[PDB]
Design a protein around this motif. Structure first.
Motif, PDB file in Angstrom:
ATOM      1  N   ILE A  43       0.873  -1.163   0.000  1.00  0.00           N
ATOM      2  CA  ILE A  43       0.000   0.000   0.000  1.00  0.00           C
ATOM      3  C   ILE A  43       0.909   1.211   0.000  1.00  0.00           C
ATOM      4  CG2 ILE A  43      -1.685   1.344   1.317  1.00  0.00           C
ATOM      5  CD1 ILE A  43      -2.754  -1.379   2.396  1.00  0.00           C
ATOM      6  N   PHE A  58      -8.824  -7.547   6.521  1.00  0.00           N
ATOM      7  CA  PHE A  58      -9.142  -6.465   7.478  1.00  0.00           C
ATOM      8  C   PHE A  58     -10.424  -6.719   8.276  1.00  0.00           C
ATOM      9  CE2 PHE A  58      -5.416  -4.355   6.524  1.00  0.00           C
ATOM     10  CZ  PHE A  58      -5.299  -4.015   5.186  1.00  0.00           C
ATOM     11  N   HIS A  60     -11.350  -4.802  10.839  1.00  0.00           N
ATOM     12  CA  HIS A  60     -11.762  -3.556  11.488  1.00  0.00           C
ATOM     13  C   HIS A  60     -12.714  -2.674  10.677  1.00  0.00           C
ATOM     14  CE1 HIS A  60      -9.046  -1.098   9.003  1.00  0.00           C
ATOM     15  NE2 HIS A  60      -8.335  -2.216   8.981  1.00  0.00           N
ATOM     16  N   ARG A  75      -5.473  -3.639  15.776  1.00  0.00           N
ATOM     17  CA  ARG A  75      -4.246  -4.409  15.884  1.00  0.00           C
ATOM     18  C   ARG A  75      -3.580  -4.244  17.258  1.00  0.00           C
ATOM     19  NH1 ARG A  75      -1.858  -7.852  17.060  1.00  0.00           N
ATOM     20  NH2 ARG A  75       0.327  -8.333  16.577  1.00  0.00           N
ATOM     21  N   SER A  76      -3.607  -3.015  17.774  1.00  0.00           N
ATOM     22  CA  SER A  76      -3.089  -2.707  19.104  1.00  0.00           C
ATOM     23  C   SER A  76      -3.793  -3.467  20.214  1.00  0.00           C
ATOM     24  CB  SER A  76      -3.154  -1.209  19.361  1.00  0.00           C
ATOM     25  OG  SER A  76      -2.195  -0.578  18.530  1.00  0.00           O
ATOM     26  N   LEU A 117       6.622  -3.327  17.006  1.00  0.00           N
ATOM     27  CA  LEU A 117       6.351  -2.605  15.770  1.00  0.00           C
ATOM     28  C   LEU A 117       7.660  -2.352  15.011  1.00  0.00           C
ATOM     29  CD1 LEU A 117       4.028  -1.454  14.132  1.00  0.00           C
ATOM     30  CD2 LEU A 117       3.917   0.481  15.761  1.00  0.00           C
ATOM     31  N   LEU A 120       8.600  -4.986  12.628  1.00  0.00           N
ATOM     32  CA  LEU A 120       7.820  -5.060  11.398  1.00  0.00           C
ATOM     33  C   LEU A 120       8.056  -3.867  10.480  1.00  0.00           C
ATOM     34  CD1 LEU A 120       4.296  -6.090  12.807  1.00  0.00           C
ATOM     35  CD2 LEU A 120       6.159  -7.634  12.280  1.00  0.00           C
ATOM     36  N   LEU A 127       4.999  -3.636   7.923  1.00  0.00           N
ATOM     37  CA  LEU A 127       4.195  -4.820   7.644  1.00  0.00           C
ATOM     38  C   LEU A 127       2.890  -4.746   8.400  1.00  0.00           C
ATOM     39  CD1 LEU A 127       6.813  -7.673   7.856  1.00  0.00           C
ATOM     40  CD2 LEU A 127       5.603  -6.896   5.783  1.00  0.00           C
ATOM     41  N   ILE A 128       1.774  -4.911   7.700  1.00  0.00           N
ATOM     42  CA  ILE A 128       0.462  -4.908   8.339  1.00  0.00           C
ATOM     43  C   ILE A 128      -0.250  -6.224   8.052  1.00  0.00           C
ATOM     44  CG2 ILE A 128       0.251  -2.379   8.273  1.00  0.00           C
ATOM     45  CD1 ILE A 128      -1.881  -2.910   5.924  1.00  0.00           C
ATOM     46  N   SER A 129      -1.410  -6.396   8.683  1.00  0.00           N
ATOM     47  CA  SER A 129      -2.227  -7.626   8.637  1.00  0.00           C
ATOM     48  C   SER A 129      -1.451  -8.947   8.565  1.00  0.00           C
ATOM     49  CB  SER A 129      -3.278  -7.551   7.530  1.00  0.00           C
ATOM     50  OG  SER A 129      -2.652  -7.606   6.267  1.00  0.00           O
ATOM     51  N   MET A 151       2.524   7.969  12.771  1.00  0.00           N
ATOM     52  CA  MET A 151       3.443   6.855  12.543  1.00  0.00           C
ATOM     53  C   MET A 151       4.905   7.276  12.373  1.00  0.00           C
ATOM     54  SD  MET A 151       2.450   3.655  12.584  1.00  0.00           S
ATOM     55  CE  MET A 151       0.866   2.978  13.047  1.00  0.00           C
TER      56      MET A 151
HETATM   57  O1  LIG Z   1      -0.143  -0.146  12.736  1.00  0.00           O
HETATM   58  C1  LIG Z   1      -0.477  -1.320  12.925  1.00  0.00           C
HETATM   59  N1  LIG Z   1      -1.369  -2.013  12.207  1.00  0.00           N
HETATM   60  C2  LIG Z   1      -2.200  -1.567  11.257  1.00  0.00           C
HETATM   61  C3  LIG Z   1      -2.407  -0.194  11.137  1.00  0.00           C
HETATM   62  C4  LIG Z   1      -3.320   0.311  10.232  1.00  0.00           C
HETATM   63  C5  LIG Z   1      -4.060  -0.549   9.433  1.00  0.00           C
HETATM   64  O2  LIG Z   1      -4.954   0.076   8.625  1.00  0.00           O
HETATM   65  C6  LIG Z   1      -5.377  -0.146   7.358  1.00  0.00           C
HETATM   66  N2  LIG Z   1      -4.550  -0.554   6.377  1.00  0.00           N
HETATM   67  C7  LIG Z   1      -5.031  -0.724   5.153  1.00  0.00           C
HETATM   68  C8  LIG Z   1      -6.378  -0.463   4.884  1.00  0.00           C
HETATM   69  C9  LIG Z   1      -7.205  -0.024   5.918  1.00  0.00           C
HETATM   70  N3  LIG Z   1      -6.681   0.132   7.119  1.00  0.00           N
HETATM   71  C10 LIG Z   1      -3.913  -1.932   9.573  1.00  0.00           C
HETATM   72  C11 LIG Z   1      -2.985  -2.447  10.499  1.00  0.00           C
HETATM   73  C12 LIG Z   1      -2.794  -3.977  10.610  1.00  0.00           C
HETATM   74  O3  LIG Z   1      -1.868  -4.450  11.343  1.00  0.00           O
HETATM   75  O4  LIG Z   1      -3.575  -4.669   9.904  1.00  0.00           O
HETATM   76  C13 LIG Z   1       0.178  -2.150  14.035  1.00  0.00           C
HETATM   77  C14 LIG Z   1      -0.092  -1.802  15.380  1.00  0.00           C
HETATM   78  C15 LIG Z   1       0.480  -2.542  16.425  1.00  0.00           C
HETATM   79  C16 LIG Z   1       1.304  -3.638  16.108  1.00  0.00           C
HETATM   80 CL1  LIG Z   1       2.072  -4.594  17.344  1.00  0.00          CL
HETATM   81  C17 LIG Z   1       1.560  -3.981  14.772  1.00  0.00           C
HETATM   82  C18 LIG Z   1       0.994  -3.246  13.721  1.00  0.00           C
HETATM   83 CL2  LIG Z   1       1.309  -3.692  12.056  1.00  0.00          CL
END
Ligand SMILES: O=C(Nc1ccc(Oc2ncccn2)cc1C(=O)O)c1ccc(Cl)cc1Cl
Lengths: 253, 254
Positions: A43, A58, A60, A75-76, A117, A120, A127-129, A151
């Motif tokens: 992304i 996702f 959320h 995620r938190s 964090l 990642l 890295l997410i999801s 961030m």
């Molecule tokens: O910032 C984090 N996660 C995300 C933040 C925004 C997000 O939002 C998002 N991304 C794409 C589309 C819509 N929303 C998704 C995540 C995730 O881990 O999945 C995060 C927080 C705490 C920890 Cl330990 C790890 C992560 Cl990866």
């Protein structure tokens, strides 16, 4: 005593592996592409984000900058439960007064979230999801009035922290040290906490000597990163001091 | 190398003694009523303040403490120069190291002059109670309390001056300072100061487990005092437009 220290180190590593699905070893392989299994979905702008919500699950999911901030909350909250499960494996933790256990987790989860964090992150994104996605640093900065500066300080810490080149073996003991800090406000019985941390710092010291024999003041450097973490957590809650009733209850913090 | 680290500990303790006229060992002898040192005059209310003095009260005290920070900074600058490598660093970095490091050092050493009940003043000749300071006018009643809360905790470590000498050296040689041009030379120096300190704490405090760890963990409190202190100066500036700040102190607060 340099064997029950190595045993406490092996215990912790094993729990850390059971508690945290996406480890640094694993996260590193995805980020460097050293393992060419599957690329994460990237992304990097508004169109890829919208495509990313179609491909990536996702859990959320209205407005984009809000949606990203809420995903980070989801995620938190998830991380909090992984850390809570890990804290229970730390020898002596469950024998502490229940209010103190709650106090140690309450003030500690944030510092550990940032630490993990960093595992990642690189200089270019996060890295997410569960490693399935990768959100670029530049795409996060390109966010709205309050949201684009949310961030960045994490990325700045990560770049610094990641230069110590710790592995999961090292991080497992380091996280335990963060949790068992006897200076949290409202603790009723600091003695057994300071005792356990003394024991964890001793195992972290030997771990760093054995695992990083060429970096002499890594222990000290890592301890002074703990104070860096307290700083970032402070200016972050202060940022959460600008940003549906049931959902606002789940995310009370 | 052990002998090298001991030599370094000796060097810095020696410069600390020559740079700081009121040591913790002197402050303790005054505070705990020894016979090597005289007893201070105690300022606990506006009456004592007046009889002790030998435009309003809170401003006189605040400005007095402000002038004492100037002396500290001078002493701190003099001591840094003696830290091996410091004067060989780029000059801009020297200024940056001093600019940021000095307040964390002032509050560390100020703990030496503090107990839970107050703080030594005028080279230990006086002692101002915590409560007299806590009862000052609206903005000035706040300024000393975070330092007291720090001192009480910091003092529980039972550091002596030979420990503080190296720890103060570590504080100055921080490569985390904003706008440092060459972080690397500063860190090599600190790596060595950290090694010396580690050795010093093991040797001087053989019974005290993880004092090295516990002392580095004390940076968080130092950062907090500094942050809260500079915020309070912003307040003072807006409400007390007739009140001054020393050139040296102007330079640092940016
Ligand atoms: O910032 C984090 N996660 C995300 C933040 C925004 C997000 O939002 C998002 N991304 C794409 C589309 C819509 N929303 C998704 C995540 C995730 O881990 O999945 C995060 C927080 C705490 C920890 Cl330990 C790890 C992560 Cl990866």
């Amino acid at each position: 005593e340099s064997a029950d220290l190595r045993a406490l180190a092996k215990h912790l590593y094993d729990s850390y592996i059971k508690s945290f699905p996406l480890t640094k070893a694993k996260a590193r392989a995805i980020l460097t592409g050293k393992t060419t299994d599957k690329s994460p979905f990237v992304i990097y702008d508004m169109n890829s984000l919208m495509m990313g919500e179609d491909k990536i699950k996702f859990k959320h999911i209205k407005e984009v900058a809000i949606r990203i901030f809420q995903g980070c909350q989801f995620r938190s909250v998830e991380a909090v439960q992984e850390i809570t499960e890990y804290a229970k494996s730390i020898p002596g933790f469950v024998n502490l007064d229940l209010n103190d256990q709650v106090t140690l987790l309450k003030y500690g989860v944030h510092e550990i979230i940032y630490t993990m964090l960093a595992s990642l992150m690189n200089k270019d994104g996060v890295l997410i999801s569960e490693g399935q996605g990768f959100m670029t640093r530049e795409f996060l900065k390109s966010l709205r009035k309050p949201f684009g500066d949310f961030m960045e300080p994490k990325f700045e810490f990560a770049v610094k922290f990641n230069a110590l080149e710790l592995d999961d073996s090292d991080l497992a003991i380091f996280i335990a040290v963060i949790i068992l800090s006897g200076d949290r406000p409202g603790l009723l019985n600091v003695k057994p906490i300071e005792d356990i941390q003394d024991n964890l710092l001793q195992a972290l010291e030997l771990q760093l000597k054995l695992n990083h024999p060429e970096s002499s003041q890594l222990f000290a450097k890592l301890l002074q990163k703990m104070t860096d973490l307290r700083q970032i957590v402070t200016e972050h809650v202060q940022l959460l001091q600008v940003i549906h009733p049931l959902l606002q209850e789940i995310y009370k913090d």
